[PDB]
Amino acid sequence: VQPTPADHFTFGLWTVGWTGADPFGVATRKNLDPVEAVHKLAELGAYGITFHDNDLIPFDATEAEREKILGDFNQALKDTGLKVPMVTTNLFSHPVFKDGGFTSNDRSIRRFALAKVLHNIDLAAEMGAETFVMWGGREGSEYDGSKDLAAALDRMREGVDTAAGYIKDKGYNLRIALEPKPNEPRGDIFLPTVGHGLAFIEQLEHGDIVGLNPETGHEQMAGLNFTHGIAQALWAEKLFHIDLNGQRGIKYDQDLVFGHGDLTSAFFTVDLLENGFPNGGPKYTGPRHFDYKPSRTDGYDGVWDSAKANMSMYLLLKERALAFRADPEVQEAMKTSGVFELGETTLNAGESAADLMNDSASFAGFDAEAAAERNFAFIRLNQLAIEHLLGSR
Amino acid sequence: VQPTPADHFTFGLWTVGWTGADPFGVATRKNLDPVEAVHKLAELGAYGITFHDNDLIPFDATEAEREKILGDFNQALKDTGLKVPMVTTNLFSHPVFKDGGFTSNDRSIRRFALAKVLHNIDLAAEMGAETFVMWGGREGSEYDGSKDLAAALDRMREGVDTAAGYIKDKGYNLRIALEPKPNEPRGDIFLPTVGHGLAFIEQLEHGDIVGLNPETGHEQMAGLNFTHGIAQALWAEKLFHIDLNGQRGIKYDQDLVFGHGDLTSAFFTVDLLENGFPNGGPKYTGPRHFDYKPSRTDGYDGVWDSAKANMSMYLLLKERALAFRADPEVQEAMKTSGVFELGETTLNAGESAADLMNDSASFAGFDAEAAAERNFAFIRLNQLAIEHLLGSR
Amino acid sequence: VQPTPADHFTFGLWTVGWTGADPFGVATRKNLDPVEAVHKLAELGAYGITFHDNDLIPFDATEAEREKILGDFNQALKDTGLKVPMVTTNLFSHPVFKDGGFTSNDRSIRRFALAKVLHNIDLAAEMGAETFVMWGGREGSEYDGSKDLAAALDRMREGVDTAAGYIKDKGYNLRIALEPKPNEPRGDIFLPTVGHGLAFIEQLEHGDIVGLNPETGHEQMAGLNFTHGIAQALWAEKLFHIDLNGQRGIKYDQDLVFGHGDLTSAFFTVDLLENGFPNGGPKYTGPRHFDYKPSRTDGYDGVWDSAKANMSMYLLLKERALAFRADPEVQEAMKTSGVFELGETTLNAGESAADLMNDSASFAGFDAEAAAERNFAFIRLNQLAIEHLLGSR
Amino acid sequence: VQPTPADHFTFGLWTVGWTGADPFGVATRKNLDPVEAVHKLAELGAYGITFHDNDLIPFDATEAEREKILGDFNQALKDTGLKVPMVTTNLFSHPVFKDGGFTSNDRSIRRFALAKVLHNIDLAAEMGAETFVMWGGREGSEYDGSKDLAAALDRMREGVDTAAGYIKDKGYNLRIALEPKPNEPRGDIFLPTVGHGLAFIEQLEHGDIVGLNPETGHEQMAGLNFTHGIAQALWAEKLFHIDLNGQRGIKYDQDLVFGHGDLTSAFFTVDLLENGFPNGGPKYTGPRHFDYKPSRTDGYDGVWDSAKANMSMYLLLKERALAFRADPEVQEAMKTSGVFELGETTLNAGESAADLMNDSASFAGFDAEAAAERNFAFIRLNQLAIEHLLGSR
Numbered sequence A, B, C, D: 001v002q003p004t005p006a007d008h009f010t011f012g013l014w015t016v017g018w019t020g021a022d023p024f025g026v027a028t029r030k031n032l033d034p035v036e037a038v039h040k041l042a043e044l045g046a047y048g049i050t051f052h053d054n055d056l057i058p059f060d061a062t063e064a065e066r067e068k069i070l071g072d073f074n075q076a077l078k079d080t081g082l083k084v085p086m087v088t089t090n091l092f093s094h095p096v097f098k099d100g101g102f103t104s105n106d107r108s109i110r111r112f113a114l115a116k117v118l119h120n121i122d123l124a125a126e127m128g129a130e131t132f133v134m135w136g137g138r139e140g141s142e143y144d145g146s147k148d149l150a151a152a153l154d155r156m157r158e159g160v161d162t163a164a165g166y167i168k169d170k171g172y173n174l175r176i177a178l179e180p181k182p183n184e185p186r187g188d189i190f191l192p193t194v195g196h197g198l199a200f201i202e203q204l205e206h207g208d209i210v211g212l213n214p215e216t217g218h219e220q221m222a223g224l225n226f227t228h229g230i231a232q233a234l235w236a237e238k239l240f241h242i243d244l245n246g247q248r249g250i251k252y253d254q255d256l257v258f259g260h261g262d263l264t265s266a267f268f269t270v271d272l273l274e275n276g277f278p279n280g281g282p283k284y285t286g287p288r289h290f291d292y293k294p295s296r297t298d299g300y301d302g303v304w305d306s307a308k309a310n311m312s313m314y315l316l317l318k319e320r321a322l323a324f325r326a327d328p329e330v331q332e333a334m335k336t337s338g339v340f341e342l343g344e345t346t347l348n349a350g351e352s353a354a355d356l357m358n359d360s361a362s363f364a365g366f367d368a369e370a371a372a373e374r375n376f377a378f379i380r381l382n383q384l385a386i387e388h389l390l391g392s393r
């Protein structure tokens, strides 16, 4: 498996660029020049690169420097042909954002945070980004009395709707994608899972251009099924972007290589992204973005091995998932378990609630004890998937 | 603290009625007659009782028996004055529902499950229930390939919309409340948290009469902040009912007495139910339903002590939460931390996105380093709440 | 992959015999005759069968009944050739054990529980069992004030030393294996993890014949690394038995087929059982016992498929783990990463503490920043392992 | 509540000195001069101060610099009267320790790490410290194949026995306290929980002067009962020290003020430290050390308020726990529930195994169903405890 730009594999500048400082220690690697990053990613088969405003342009940088940095950055995009599909803003690193960007208790920080996002939408448009991600990493609290919970959501809505209306007013060809996270760095983050993110978007004025940017590790920190989560995002037509990585359990966010976390769940994620639904339905056609961090124990060879590893892992899984669905033993097992049977409507065309109630065969003369004898054979179906995954079928 | 019917404290028949069979052993207590239950609850100060169809009427019961059981049941309501504010259906105990009610892979079980719900709406209306709860406990899977995830949600929508349209057609004065649960008994349940529940309702045809029925322990099984969750349900105008209990961690669902789980979070839950939001906003005015189970180690004295305990716990907490908010030291601490400041809009009346961007004072001439020096004093604010909670202020 | 008795696959009678009742519902399968489990398991390739005293002999069995039942089970054993490597006691199902057996608060119950175990040692001995498992499932509490925690451990020790003393006294060739579990059925169980099990054994008078029976799902319920836990048990030479199953996260104990949980972790448990430690050390050599439950969704074909799936899962992993370590590329990766270098003593032959602090090369003139440049390439090594696991290598 | 040095409240220099940097952002506070921490903590009521070698003396300090810094810190100690009960080593911040100190894969690094500890023992000894803490934060792995798990424990043992041997050899009055932690900064840390810590100590040559330093948040990160864990450490007489803080769930280690986490659990830890075991047993008598971090949202008033909050939280809990056990109603509840009955041996004075199995009253004619009728009334006892905790009693 060798990735090619047609695979649509994008990487964030901060991923490979992650130097190793964790809470208990300092960087273990030297800074990675962004132009070096572009050249190396492009040679590995990457289609595009994403970044946070401050990943490329320092917070203090003068206008001269911004322009200098951008010019070299754009040259490298040109030299290689790497695209920039998604742009995001850093509203969490600087001490000013310690209580949040949009939901900062301080009004002057909320205005600063929002102006930072508005300027960043202009650079996104300029770069050719199709998606603008918003990860509200410091929106939340450690203590329950720190915030007025309704005001926190009024304030989150106000910023997202202001950013959304601004895209609409300039006619930028951009969608906003919100990224849910249960905790870390805040004790409790607002919009903690895919569900809260999706619900939130239905209360927005400009909801039509606001979707989600779910991350594997993030849902797994709440012990949720990532494939069930993305399935619901997809079903709602809100799966706008995706961040792929690995996590081994409910603990700090590990940010491992995709596939180095929960392997079986990674296989079913690849099956949904690549194959979609068994009865047919929506499909996710966007970039396959890897949002991970190369372990601080490894040197730069490990950084480039790690980036290669995301792509191979995904291609190995895809192959196994195409073999699995194409298998006639599997398709027949699927039939036995009712996968296709779930696809038929419960009610007959034209039947009503009154009709169903009063139909003796569906209720009053229904043999519940006979219907309960059905062997759904979910275990055997699950064993077929694992054997395809182990490359044994 | 002595509860009175004005406190609006409701109990499920299955709570006090829980005999003690867990996965590792059999009942430790004798069945509790429902008429005994009504009389005992009413003498403890309860306002109402709730039930699942099969809690009162056996699955096999003939029509004669149903009528016999209902007549005695209604007599007891009359004798005591206990109301029946919520009714629910058991779509999880019988072997026929082993793959689910509405999302059963088998079509004949989906029709049986839905007819069961439609008949149960009629009894709910007849009883005077204002809420019809739906806990899809067996909707989900253990294995990711068991279900077509999009079809599972089409099928859940079809049943909830069929039940919703039926209420509308008969003009019953009832709302449907969905109850999210991450897992148990299924490995992964569909609509696992408040967020997924709320999101789901926005895709329904009859969404206007569908809200939620969040449960303390259920959100805590995903390690979520219950007060943040209910705050978002409230903010959306979807907090239709509430199930209160305790849970100590991510583990099986314990169903302890409210307040015997995460005590500090219980205090902030009571503050939101009773006091609402600091800047003002929505309020939950429904019943305070306790959905717990008296520990299998205790005999019937423990059952009635446990039921008393829910009410006292809630009243103790309420008292402490009224003292806390009424305290001028607390109100001034609140002011210092920006609780009221979060209530002001980010943008000035009439200001636009373009206006804000270009306002030098909010961005280009904004001193980020000076604004980051602010002592939010969240720790001291949190210490004030705990001291009010410990009954020391 | 086809298991043969040489593989040592053992199954508990309660595993394939699990009926399907859980907290929210009744049994979905009819009881399994023990004769039939024996014959069936002999046909699939099982080496042995294990049981709890009440799996086989009812609580209330008369003497004549006990004899018939053992006559029937000994006949099956003789006819099939299956062995009985482990026997355990049910100190959790009867309502008498609602607060524990050995650590029950009631003294009369502690005495009955120990008497129930003593009698079971005799039976274990008559079956030709090598291991006697102790899973104290009801030993614990829901509430912190329910127990005197120092008295609970003296009571546990009393119990286990009385049982060990008796073994020695009767001259039985039986070792006791204690099975840790963090929670369920109690809120908190005593001796919650492998480490707590090992620690307790060292306070025992007859600790020489007492070791552990760690189970996969149990350790994963506290979020621990099951392979790290059994390596510590192995290292102290206390790994007497093992229970293999799958667990998908911190939640109720799922009891899935081995490998249907955390796959990579399963892969690495199989490497440690098959290959042992990279630098040499003790090796586990007892039964590979499966303590799982066929999902309640599945009918009896599912039951024998699930039994089979355990043994295939193990044989596919074993095939991969042996290929993994035989690969020259992997052996090279391991060396690079320092896996063999970890096996060399830190100190030199006859080097004292004073000698090493004195040595200037080791400390005072040690170049900490050049040593920190080593690329351990742990990511690459992990990628190699996963490629072997996926059968792409 | 006003703490006095008689209370034994000790604080680490790194606690109040924590600057605010985390994974997603930079420091929000300026460095704290150690002289100032000493004076400030003496003014709040602290009994002592603890530190890591590099909290005080920079990694790269010259000899002259080291002397100045110790002269400055000894002067502060002399001026304030504060003691130095514990000293620890930083084997996690330098990039050299990226794979561990003691269990690093690189042998040159293991040697430097142990040399770094030996030198620190001398310093500990010169400060008049009673305890030497060992927190192996970088000992572990992200990936299962990175380590030889039997070799990692031999390397750990080597390290800890070399340090213990040296203590004995120099005649220092110092005990080693090992501090378990399940994860963070590594994916999986070696000796993850109190039980694993205790187990390992028993494989040590010089285990007599090696015990534990359990921390509240660490045990809660695996979801364990912190009070049950320290009771097992106490029971084996291995509770040498303790680190108190708060943790709200299975997630990153939060380091909140003691009591700002799980309150009820905190209540019950304070009862065990203050009141000991209901039936008598060992009692903990060392420092009550706070290893927490003032939230990064708070400025320096917040820092001294947080230091204060730890000691008030402890004194409010202590006040409640002493009142709790003094209450005649509580003493009665405890007796009813069998808390004292658990403290009676199961067997009679000189009763053998054979004697008890023989006794017909204990087994053969034991009435299991009448014994099962006991109401343990654990719920009522829990309600009494929580009412004492809320100061309503």
Ligand SMILES: OC[C@@H](O)[C@H](O)[C@@H](O)CO
Binding pocket: A052, A088, A089, A133, A134, A135, A179, A181, A215, A243, A253, A291
């Ligand atoms: O937890 C970190 C988040 O994953 C970010 O990397 C977003 O994807 C971009 O701000």
Ligand SMILES: OC[C@@H](O)[C@H](O)[C@@H](O)CO
Binding pocket: B052, B088, B089, B133, B134, B135, B179, B181, B215, B243, B253, B291
């Ligand atoms: O987990 C069980 C659920 O809480 C139910 O009790 C619903 O509230 C009613 O079906």
Ligand SMILES: OC[C@@H](O)[C@H](O)[C@@H](O)CO
Binding pocket: C052, C088, C089, C133, C135, C179, C181, C215, C243, C253, C291
């Ligand atoms: O959690 C259930 C346990 O795994 C038991 O089956 C033991 O293995 C033997 O009682």
Ligand SMILES: OC[C@@H](O)[C@H](O)[C@@H](O)CO
Binding pocket: D052, D088, D089, D133, D135, D179, D181, D215, D243, D253, D291
């Ligand atoms: O997880 C961090 C630890 O608690 C440390 O502060 C130790 O207590 C000493 O290194």
Ligand SMILES: [Mg+2]
Binding pocket: A135, A179, A215, A243, A291
């Ligand atoms: Mg991301």
Ligand SMILES: [Mg+2]
Binding pocket: B135, B179, B215, B243, B291
């Ligand atoms: Mg409920």
Ligand SMILES: [Mg+2]
Binding pocket: C179, C215, C243, C291
């Ligand atoms: Mg087991």
Ligand SMILES: [Mg+2]
Binding pocket: D179, D215, D243, D291
């Ligand atoms: Mg600590």
